[PDB]
């Protein structure tokens, strides 16, 4: 089924970040060739606290990057909404300055509060399997487990956990950041994810426009493969596969 | 600079295998949506070798593609040469894929026989593309014979495991003076994209597509994956963040 | 160095589970050859409940071990606390392993219930060691409650997969202010050794030893593996050579 | 069983290189604590090849070990044969490790020259052990020449990455009719243990030990790792649990 969040459907399963591109011209070009329908951005890092873009053609997913506690995240979200730049909110509460991995307690807390306030909520979380279900039980509109640490470029580090999260989900699962190249974006969709959220892997490339194109194709390719029923892994029964 | 083998250029970097699809209609549609320019097939298992088996490449306009018949079935260089000669005599050979399997369990290639068959076929005027392992120096040895491309396998034929040794593949691509096309052992788009991301000039696929529940859709998936991986390669992907933890000896 | 938890030291950094061995004779021999000083056991499945279940500690001279009863079987913090109280009242509790599984399929831990149970048991005077996931910040949240050790799993219980996310484990061990012991998901010596090579203070295993065709021999192997891994960590292993290939962006 | 090569038995399954230690004193104690019975060394780089070069075997009591000189440095089969002959004339050769590197960047072996050198040395009466890649059929071609052991690399020499293709190594070990010893590329105990867990008859290492901050302690760690891995192989480890997720097609 077409990616649907909070009752709204999207033709593109690729969520694109904005803000760290070399220039607005390159950013606008990248956004276009990506064909993304949902654009995400760090609210804090903006004048109100992305130009040359007709926001009327996109759904805005501002995030609370910079927040250390649920309270700071709620403050940022309320401002985004009041500023008219929020169709849905990406709850992001980083709890480690070194790894930049999310704080589960604060994410759980902020998600519950923002749901009570009427927001369409999408929490950025780790690949902790039960935690993901806990977030869903609050009533969030999507769950966004990270493939790996933000900006690591390592791709998905724990396919097994991601598989558990996707298979138990009752709302869309979108792999968020930690992506480095098309192979990672494709793998996420191959595992059954409903979409992928990318930012630095594209804006940080030597040629952002080309990479944005590559990611668009990779997400499509991975989704098609998932739907097509790929071949299984051949069983050889050697020592490298204990129990086989 | 698109894929160029033996002086001929190809718009598509995806080489598609034919012959094991559920039907000729599905195969035709798969070939079309893949946009592949080079079609590969095991000639030994076709009507031309014996009229007890249907022929592949059916319903296909052979004039719109470059044919890469392979010597699957050969156990020795001599058997490979026999197959190649017959394929050429039958008008189904533009280039030959030298495949000499030396293990019935893993289906991995025999290096000695592959080197032998490759040298012989080059002497006979063929455009030669050897299927080989990811043994780095072996790849250079093959190039030194004068082959027109080197086709290291990502993993064993039909394993569906993708690239098992990206480091070795990286060494092979970085030292090559002719195109490098990752051949089989591919299971999904992520693997095809990765090959291109490492710098491969192309990917050769068969069972991954023909064996999927929906071959036509997977054919389209692989086409997109190869294009995506190649684009990423050209675009200069971001590096890996260095955290300096014990999981990375040397930070 | 020497493993120290709650101020108590142990010569062996290998923690061993009891209760699932083929027999008590084998369990006794496996425990002995392992040289482990800390034994864990699921109180919920023992005789100290309603119906007479087996006494997993039968034939063992308990004066030779520090007891770490666990709350396996608990679905909520409340049930975990009750199990811990039971172990304490039965005189079989030196420290408590808090385990609250939240997924019947993966058997992965419930972070909310684990946080809750840990805080409650600390309030009740126990030396607390929570079993947790490899969620990095979660590990710190547990430490910040005042627990005496953190026990992140290498992979799901009984998976035999070994360490699935060494990076996350590395962050957990490097930020920790209490001992970090990799718990379960271990399949063979290579995994136990890796855990120690990453800087873990110890490893806790159960079925990888009890479920092997030769439990006693595997106990010996794990003993040697944990020792080897630790020595390597201390010896300063060689770095990864960099070739500058596309496979290393 | 016991590691047997050319009819000769060895108590230790750990083969150790010499000549790259911080000092001969450290080398001696490292070799001692490793309990290795077979020592390898690069003849082309020591005194017997050029008086201007030192003797990597100083202070060692060679009568306590079986000598496995290697042809490291040889770029062709001819050079390898020459090095082997020298080692023999110097009375420093019980078995010969054939090593013909064909890439200066990766240091990976030349299959053609290795095949050629092995054949020639066998003809000249040597007990031959070729260093090779993890090319599965290549390993068998070498065996079929009549060699006494096959030594596939886990990864490139000095890479410290451990075993990069366990599947291929598994095929090599399962098809072999002679001992298979994983040679170099090893970085820590987890790798040595894994090699044995896959069923290797032994492991050969050098810089992972000689290059550690504490070579003596690392030598001990590797001794324990090889023992642990072997014990696990024999003990019958637990299988990999299957969850039937998309991550396992």
UniProtKB/Swiss-Prot annotation, chains C, D:
GO terms for molecular function: thiazole synthase activity. Keywords: Cytoplasm, Schiff base, Thiamine biosynthesis, Transferase. One of its GO terms (biological process) is thiamine diphosphate biosynthetic process. The keyword Metal-binding does not apply. The active site is at residue 97. Pathway: Cofactor biosynthesis; thiamine diphosphate biosynthesis. The keyword Cytoplasm applies. Its main location: cytoplasm. Pfam families: ThiG (PF05690). Transmembrane segments: none annotated. It catalyses: [ThiS sulfur-carrier protein]-C-terminal-Gly-aminoethanethioate + 2-iminoacetate + 1-deoxy-D-xylulose 5-phosphate = [ThiS sulfur-carrier protein]-C-terminal Gly-Gly + 2-[(2R,5Z)-2-carboxy-4-methylthiazol-5(2H)-ylidene]ethyl phosphate + 2 H2O + H(+). Changing residue 99 to A: Activity reduced 38-fold. It is an enzyme of class 2 (transferase). Its EC number is 2.8.1.10. It comes from the Bacteria. 1-deoxy-D-xylulose 5-phosphate binds at residues 158, 184-185, 206-207. It is found in: Cytoplasm. GO terms for cellular component: 2-iminoacetate synthase complex; cytoplasm. Belongs to the ThiG family. Catalyzes the rearrangement of 1-deoxy-D-xylulose 5-phosphate (DXP) to produce the thiazole phosphate moiety of thiamine. Sulfur is provided by the thiocarboxylate moiety of the carrier protein ThiS. In vitro, sulfur can be provided by H(2)S. Homotetramer. Forms heterodimers with either ThiH or ThiS. This is Thiazole synthase.
């Amino acid at each position: 089924s077409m990616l649907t969040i909070g009752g709204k459907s999207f033709q593109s399963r690729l969520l694109l970040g904005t803000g760290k591109y070399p220039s607005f011209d390159i950013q606008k070009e990248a956004v276009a060739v990506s064909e993304s329908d949902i654009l995400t951005f760090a609210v804090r890092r903006m004048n109100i606290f992305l130009e040359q873009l007709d926001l009327s053609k996109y759904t805005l997913l501002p995030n609370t990057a910079g927040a250390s506690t649920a309270e700071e995240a709620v403050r940022i979200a309320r401002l985004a909404k009041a500023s008219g730049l929020c169709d849905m909110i990406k709850v992001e509460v980083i709890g480690c300055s070194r790894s930049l991995l999310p704080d589960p307690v604060e994410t759980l807390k902020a998600s519950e509060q923002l749901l009570e306030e009427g927001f369409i909520v999408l929490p950025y979380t780790s690949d902790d399997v039960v935690l993901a279900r806990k977030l869903e039980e609050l009533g969030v509109h999507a769950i966004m487990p990270g493939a790996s640490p933000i900006g690591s470029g390592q791709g998905i580090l724990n396919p097994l956990n991601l598989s558990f999260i996707i298979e138990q989900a009752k709302v869309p699962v979108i792999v968020d950041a930690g992506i480095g190249s098309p192979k990672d974006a494709a793998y996420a969709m191959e595992l059954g994810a409903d979409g992928v959220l990318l930012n630095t892997a594209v804006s940080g490339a030597d040629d952002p426009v080309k990479m944005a194109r590559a990611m668009k194709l990779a997400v499509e390719a991975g989704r098609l493969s998932y739907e097509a029923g790929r071949i299984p892994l051949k069983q050889y029964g050697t020592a490298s596969s204990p129990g086989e």
